[PDB]
Amino acid sequence: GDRVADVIESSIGDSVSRALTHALPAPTGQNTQVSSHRLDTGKVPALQAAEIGASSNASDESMIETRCVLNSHSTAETTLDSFFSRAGLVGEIDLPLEGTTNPNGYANWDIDITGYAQMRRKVELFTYMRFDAEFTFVACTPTGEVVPQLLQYMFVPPGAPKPDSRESLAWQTATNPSVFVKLSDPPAQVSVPFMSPASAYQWFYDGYPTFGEHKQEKDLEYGACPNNMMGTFSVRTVGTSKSKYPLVVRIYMRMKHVRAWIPRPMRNQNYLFKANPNYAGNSIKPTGASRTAITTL
């Protein structure tokens, strides 16, 4: 029971986050209303105080004399799904015959889509994103030729044994999901759910994954969030003897059922590494084009 007044009247424990704004339906661009000449004192729409942190509330109607315009231009193509649900390249896996990389007929790719700038720059517009995804695998030789070869793709979640060879016992794939397909077949394609332990994936994590002294040698772990590490994608040619052909597997991703939070400035310096935002300090370039004078086009 409670009796002292400050306890009865406190707000400690209020889980209802009060919201100063609410969404409205806006299937089309706003219309324009007729406006006429205004010659007033006291009324001043053109004057703002940008210091406040809000954007101007001035509209066409109050700055010039406007006609009526019934605007039926749609706002549909700028939704998150419209913008992101377009498959882009996010991974490439080589399975050469003669080589330095994966000459043993198998390969393990850590699921990380930050190795390609087009896709990466789009997702990094937001801090947190939650989505399902459709993955498509396009395979052929390095000339784009289609050969009669059978492949096996297997998803190895964190903790499952990563194959260490084309004949690894792990390919028995009794619980991991595997896909068997020919290069002659169309590109394999599957749906992937939102698998993070968190409520959303996050493209930026300003922190460390563990406790302790964060000395020089461990600084590569700054920004590492296991909540974003979904596992390994393993591929092999299905056989006990080496394949007769050199292969390449391109990985495409199409997000769907997207939600995103906290917009942020968009990358304006070339990307260097997957794991961080490092930029080349001797080549800091302006965000865009320049000119000779401010008084000349």
The only residue of 113, 139, 151, 258 in contact with ligand 906, by rule CB under 6 A: 113
- CA gap 108, 152 in Å, rounded: 12
The answer to whether residues 104 and 265 touch, using CB atoms and an 8 Å cutoff, is: no
Using CB under 8 A as the binding rule, whether residue 20 contacts a copy of itself is answered as no
Site string for other proteins, 72-111 (x = CB under 8 A): xxxx-xx---xx--x-------------------------
The only residue of 32, 66, 168, 228 in contact with ligand 906, by rule CB under 6 A: 228
Using CB under 8 A as the binding rule, whether residue 18 contacts other proteins is answered as yes
Q: In angstroms, what is the minimal distance from the CB of 83 to ligand 906?
A: 16
DSSP code at position 97: S
Using CB under 8 A as the binding rule, whether residue 89 contacts a copy of itself is answered as yes
Number of neighbouring beta carbons within 10 Å of residue 104:
15
The answer to whether residues 127 and 146 touch, using CB atoms and an 8 Å cutoff, is: no
* Sole residue written with tokens 């059922």: 257
> Segment contacting other proteins (CB under 8 A): 39-47, 103-111, 166-174, 179-187?
166-174
* Sole residue written with tokens 């100063």: 20
- Pairing relationship of beta strands 247-263 and 126-140 according to DSSP bridges: antiparallel
Using CB under 8 A as the binding rule, whether residue 3 contacts a copy of itself is answered as yes
- CA gap 272, 284 in Å, rounded: 13
Number of neighbouring beta carbons within 10 Å of residue 107:
19
Nearest by Cα to 29 from 73, 78, 62: 73
Please choose which of ligand 906, a copy of itself, other proteins, none residue 100 contacts, taking the beta carbon within 5 to 8 angstroms, the exact cut-off set by kind. Answer: none
Which H/E stretch holds residue 253?
strand 247-263
Using CB under 8 A as the binding rule, whether residue 12 contacts a copy of itself is answered as yes
Provide the token pair at 96: 């050469």
The only residue of 88, 103, 209, 231 in contact with a copy of itself, by rule CB under 8 A: 88
Q: In angstroms, what is the minimal distance from the CB of 286 to a copy of itself?
A: 49
Terminal-to-terminal C-alpha distance of the chain:
75
The only residue of 111, 151, 156, 258 in contact with ligand 906, by rule CB under 6 A: 111
Nearer to other proteins, 148 or 158 (CB): 158
Nearest by Cα to 195 from 231, 153, 235, 224: 231
Using CB under 6 A as the binding rule, whether residue 276 contacts ligand 906 is answered as no
Q: In angstroms, what is the minimal distance from the CB of 251 to other proteins?
A: 20
Using CB under 6 A as the binding rule, whether residue 192 contacts ligand 906 is answered as yes
- CA gap 207, 225 in Å, rounded: 8
**Which residues bind to ligand 906, rule: CB under 6 A?**
111-114, 133, 135, 153-155, 177-179, 190, 192, 201, 203, 228, 230, 233, 274-275
**Which residues bind to a copy of itself, rule: CB under 8 A?**
1-8, 10-16, 66-68, 83, 86-89, 171-178
